[PDB]
Amino acid sequence: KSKKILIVGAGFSGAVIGRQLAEKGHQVHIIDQRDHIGGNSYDARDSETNVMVHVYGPHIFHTDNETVWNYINKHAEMMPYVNRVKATVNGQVFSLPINLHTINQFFSKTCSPDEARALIAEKGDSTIADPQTFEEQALRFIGKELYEAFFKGYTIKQWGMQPSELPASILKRLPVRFNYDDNYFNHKFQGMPKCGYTQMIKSILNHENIKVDLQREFIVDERTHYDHVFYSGPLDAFYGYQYGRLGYRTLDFKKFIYQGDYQGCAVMNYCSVDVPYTRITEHKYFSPWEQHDGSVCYKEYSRACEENDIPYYPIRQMGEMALLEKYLSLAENETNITFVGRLGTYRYLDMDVTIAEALKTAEVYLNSLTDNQPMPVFTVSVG
Amino acid sequence: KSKKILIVGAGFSGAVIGRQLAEKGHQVHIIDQRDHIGGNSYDARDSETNVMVHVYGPHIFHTDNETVWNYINKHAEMMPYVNRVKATVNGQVFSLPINLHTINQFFSKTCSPDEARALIAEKGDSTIADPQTFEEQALRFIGKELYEAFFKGYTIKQWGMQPSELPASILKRLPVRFNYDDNYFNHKFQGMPKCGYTQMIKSILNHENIKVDLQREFIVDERTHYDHVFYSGPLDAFYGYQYGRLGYRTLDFKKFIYQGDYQGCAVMNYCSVDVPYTRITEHKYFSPWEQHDGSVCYKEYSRACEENDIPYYPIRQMGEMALLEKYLSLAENETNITFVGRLGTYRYLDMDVTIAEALKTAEVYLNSLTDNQPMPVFTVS
Numbered sequence A: 001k002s003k004k005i006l007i008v009g010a011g012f013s014g015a016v017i018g019r020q021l022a023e024k025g026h027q028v029h030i031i032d033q034r035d036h037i038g039g040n041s042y043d044a045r046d047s048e049t050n051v052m053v054h055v056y057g058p059h060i061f062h063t064d065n066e067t068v069w070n071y072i073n074k075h076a077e078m079m080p081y082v083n084r085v086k087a088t089v090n091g092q093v094f095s096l097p098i099n100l101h102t103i104n105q106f107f108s109k110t111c112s113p114d115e116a117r118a119l120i121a122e123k124g125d126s127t128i129a130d131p132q133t134f135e136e137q138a139l140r141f142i143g144k145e146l147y148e149a150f151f152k153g154y155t156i157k158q159w160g161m162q163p164s165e166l167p168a169s170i171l172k173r174l175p176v177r178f179n180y181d182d183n184y185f186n187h188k189f190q191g192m193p194k195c196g197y198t199q200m201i202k203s204i205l206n207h208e209n210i211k212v213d214l215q216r217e218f219i220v221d222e223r224t225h226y227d228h229v230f231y232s233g234p235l236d237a238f239y240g241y242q243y244g245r246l247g248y249r250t251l252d253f254k255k256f257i258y259q260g261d262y263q264g265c266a267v268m269n270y271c272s273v274d275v276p277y278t279r280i281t282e283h284k285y286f287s288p289w290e291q292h293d294g295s296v297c298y299k300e301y302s303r304a305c306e307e308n309d310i311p312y313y314p315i316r317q318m319g320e321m322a323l324l325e326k327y328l329s330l331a332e333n334e335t336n337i338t339f340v341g342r343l344g345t346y347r348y349l350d351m352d353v354t355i356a357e358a359l360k361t362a363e364v365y366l367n368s369l370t371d372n373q374p375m376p377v378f379t380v381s382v383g
Numbered sequence B: 001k002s003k004k005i006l007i008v009g010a011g012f013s014g015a016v017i018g019r020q021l022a023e024k025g026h027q028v029h030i031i032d033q034r035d036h037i038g039g040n041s042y043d044a045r046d047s048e049t050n051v052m053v054h055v056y057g058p059h060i061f062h063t064d065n066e067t068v069w070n071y072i073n074k075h076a077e078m079m080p081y082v083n084r085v086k087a088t089v090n091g092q093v094f095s096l097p098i099n100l101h102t103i104n105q106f107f108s109k110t111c112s113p114d115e116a117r118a119l120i121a122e123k124g125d126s127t128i129a130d131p132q133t134f135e136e137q138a139l140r141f142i143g144k145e146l147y148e149a150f151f152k153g154y155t156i157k158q159w160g161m162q163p164s165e166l167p168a169s170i171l172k173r174l175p176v177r178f179n180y181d182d183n184y185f186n187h188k189f190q191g192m193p194k195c196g197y198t199q200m201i202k203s204i205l206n207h208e209n210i211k212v213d214l215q216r217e218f219i220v221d222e223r224t225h226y227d228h229v230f231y232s233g234p235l236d237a238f239y240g241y242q243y244g245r246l247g248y249r250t251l252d253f254k255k256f257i258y259q260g261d262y263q264g265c266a267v268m269n270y271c272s273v274d275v276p277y278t279r280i281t282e283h284k285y286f287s288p289w290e291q292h293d294g295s296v297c298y299k300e301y302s303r304a305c306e307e308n309d310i311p312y313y314p315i316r317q318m319g320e321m322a323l324l325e326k327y328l329s330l331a332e333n334e335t336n337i338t339f340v341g342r343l344g345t346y347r348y349l350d351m352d353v354t355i356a357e358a359l360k361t362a363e364v365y366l367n368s369l370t371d372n373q374p375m376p377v378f379t380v381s
């Protein structure tokens, strides 16, 4: 039997869940409160320059998950693109993430890989048994100089907290590289959709069993008209923020246009705390197969997400997780709804991860129909 | 009607011409004086370390020709790979080709693309009206500091001549990229074959109608036993060097083994004339999908190609070109032979260009049979 399915959000989570269910006979209704599909992966062209802008931040696809990679290759033409980030600090321009070139330039050396290991082991404090803070992780592995140049001010700008108050886990993600590889991501598959993500999501959304209504906020009354609801909007919002708002950072993107090449690369970080934006992005460099004389650029600023700002990065410290636990115990009591995605589960999720989880969620739901088991509220852990 | 083809050389020129024709019926005899196939593209695994070594120096595949790309993808699995070269001079490590990073690092600046254009325009030596040498052209374009750090020394080593001895026309464009792009090659397709060029050519060569004999020299007396000869060996040698030897640079490779990552990139250039090698190459870096604890490296030394050396880079200056012209006008009176390849034609040819010209050559020969026309001696200009 064909089921009636409400899906709240037309970003990757809604779109991929909808597509998998559509293809199996169910009637899928996808709503989104914005006037366009795509969620935070949405891109659109700038009128004047015709530059394709990644509206809610640069979005670089990267994955080791070949199943996911083949899936999106069914919906776009993936162009090779290797993200290579630069940084300006101390009157110089460096390569990130920290590599043998960054090391040799910063200390004015011509170390080989093994000489650079010895120079960095010497700067690091191997007396720290198990770093508990971001700061201690930097002192342990990269040393004071590298830390204060590349990480301290930059991290303070992103998080609005001292690094001695942030977990080690943030920097554990980012080892020093003792060769000349300056690819930002190590994933086996990396690229950018030739006609953009909006178009990719449009192809995912393109089926006979899917109706998509925009400018349409979810209404708690609707649930009864459907067999199941998939919700990728904010968890706290669905509960009227009755216990408080989940803490996020937000970003302000300050637009400017330049005639020519403003910086010569897609991403420039500004490591100094005394430079108020975290970075400048030059969006035409995200589509190097195209040529554009005019250029759309953004200065990006980080700050605490207030009531009417878009939530970007979830903060997820003790207070935030105590608040989450309260919404979760409301959530565990529900029937015929599943909360999914970055907003629905209060997790930062890359595009490929979001896709893989959306495929699994559809599969769980389909399996639950044929086994006549109830569909759980979450198909992922958040304890 | 089935032709007896002799093809001199089992590198890309002969392999590709040979397969195109073997597939339309002709009997193809390929010979090569060396003891392995592949010509200068040949690779092989080093015994101690198992690193795939590029025996005649690094070979990176790159093209904008998608027909050529699809063609090698039939005979190999192409892995992605983007060449990015580092260079050590004056106690610093830089990015090449010269780019906005090289410039900011070199001068200690944080220039944007356009401020950097303004910076190089001032450094450019503007008192030099009408430059005649490579030296003067470089000086006018980018000034003394950049010229002497990155060009003067490396030119001396690479060409065995001072840039004052070479023509201004050798570099027609200001050589700075005013962006952060440090991909050495700008081609749409770039990659490395997962199992090596030798296996790729071994696959091009695998046909019933193709016999390959190695350790086998061409001998003029052979010509009479075949209907056509495709010749990829050196044009001057084919005619006994009767007018002189075409000028080339040759390269010496000095092998060492390091346990670890010796330098942390495939290719490190040394710009200084006081360092006698041109580059150090670390070959495992040409196969990043592979992991190796032991690493095979080479210091590369460039010198004049003398009579017993392998010819690498064609010098192609005034005298060499006049000299080439003489063998060309002898070749123009040959019949039943076509000269092809970097050696048969005295050109530096990429792998992709060489494959495209081979496919076209076989086709021109196929067409000439069906149309009853004579095959030309050269299939390019």
Ligand SMILES: Cc1cc2nc3c(=O)[nH]c(=O)nc-3n(C[C@H](O)[C@H](O)[C@H](O)COP(=O)(O)OP(=O)(O)OC[C@H]3O[C@@H](n4cnc5c(N)ncnc54)[C@H](O)[C@@H]3O)c2cc1C
Pocket (backbone or CB within 6 Å): A008, A009, A010, A011, A012, A013, A014, A031, A032, A033, A034, A037, A038, A039, A040, A041, A056, A057, A058, A059, A060, A061, A062, A216, A217, A218, A232, A233, A234, A237, A311, A312, A313, A340, A341, A342, A343, A349, A350, A351, A352, A354
């Ligand atoms: C700054 C930033 C940079 C990023 N960069 C990368 C990157 O480089 N690479 C990468 O792989 N990933 C990146 N990501 C992750 C990426 O954006 C997510 O993977 C993806 O957006 C998740 O999609 P989703 O559909 O689950 O959620 P979303 O895209 O957020 O979409 C959810 C949808 O729900 C709608 N909605 C919410 N509430 C309601 C409501 N009550 N009623 C109706 N509609 C509602 C919203 O309007 C929205 O359109 C980045 C994320 C951020 C914040």
Ligand SMILES: Cc1cc2nc3c(=O)[nH]c(=O)nc-3n(C[C@H](O)[C@H](O)[C@H](O)COP(=O)(O)OP(=O)(O)OC[C@H]3O[C@@H](n4cnc5c(N)ncnc54)[C@H](O)[C@@H]3O)c2cc1C
Pocket (backbone or CB within 6 Å): B008, B009, B010, B011, B012, B013, B014, B031, B032, B033, B034, B037, B038, B039, B040, B041, B056, B057, B058, B059, B060, B061, B062, B216, B217, B218, B232, B233, B234, B251, B311, B312, B313, B340, B341, B342, B343, B349, B350, B351, B352, B354
């Ligand atoms: C230092 C160097 C670096 C290079 N790097 C790149 C690179 O990164 N990427 C790229 O695309 N290309 C590169 N190339 C170009 C590449 O090597 C050529 O494209 C390729 O070798 C062309 O193959 P071919 O068959 O025409 O000629 P060759 O490979 O030179 O083959 C000619 C064959 O003919 C044989 N032969 C000659 N005379 C006789 C005779 N008397 N009797 C019998 N056999 C004979 C030879 O033994 C040889 O095996 C490089 C070239 C050089 C010199």
Ligand SMILES: Cc1cc2nc3c(=O)[nH]c(=O)nc-3n(C[C@H](O)[C@H](O)[C@H](O)COP(=O)(O)O)c2cc1C
Pocket (backbone or CB within 6 Å): A158, A159, A249, A313, A314, A315, A348
């Ligand atoms: C509060 C916060 C939480 C973040 N959580 C993640 C995360 O879980 N995974 C991730 O890849 N990036 C996360 N990021 C961002 C990265 O650490 C990264 O450095 C940042 O997005 C800017 O640089 P990037 O886009 O190159 O990664 C977070 C950023 C902030 C401010």
Ligand SMILES: Cc1cc2nc3c(=O)[nH]c(=O)nc-3n(C[C@H](O)[C@H](O)[C@H](O)COP(=O)(O)O)c2cc1C
Pocket (backbone or CB within 6 Å): B096, B097, B154, B158, B185, B269
């Ligand atoms: C340091 C350096 C020196 C080079 N010297 C030469 C040279 O002497 N002759 C030459 O033809 N190319 C030389 N090149 C290669 C040139 O950059 C050239 O632009 C390009 O590689 C030409 O080939 P393409 O057909 O792939 O574009 C040199 C490159 C570098 C970085």
Ligand SMILES: Cc1cc2nc3c(=O)[nH]c(=O)nc-3n(C[C@H](O)[C@H](O)[C@H](O)COP(=O)(O)O)c2cc1C
Pocket (backbone or CB within 6 Å): B096, B097, B098, B150, B151, B152, B154, B155, B170, B171, B175, B176, B177, B184, B186
């Ligand atoms: C004939 C020739 C000689 C060159 N010699 C040098 C050199 O000595 N040092 C150097 O850094 N670059 C040298 N170059 C490299 C120029 O930067 C090269 O054209 C540059 O890579 C062009 O880059 P592009 O790919 O942006 O066109 C040479 C290039 C050519 C064609």
Ligand SMILES: Cc1cc2nc3c(=O)[nH]c(=O)nc-3n(C[C@H](O)[C@H](O)[C@H](O)COP(=O)(O)O)c2cc1C
Pocket (backbone or CB within 6 Å): B158, B159, B249, B278, B313, B314, B315, B348
């Ligand atoms: C005399 C001479 C001619 C060369 N001609 C070419 C050429 O036509 N195309 C090319 O890509 N490289 C050519 N090169 C090699 C280039 O200089 C460049 O360095 C190549 O990208 C790396 O070769 P190399 O660094 O050993 O010189 C030539 C080198 C020399 C010495």
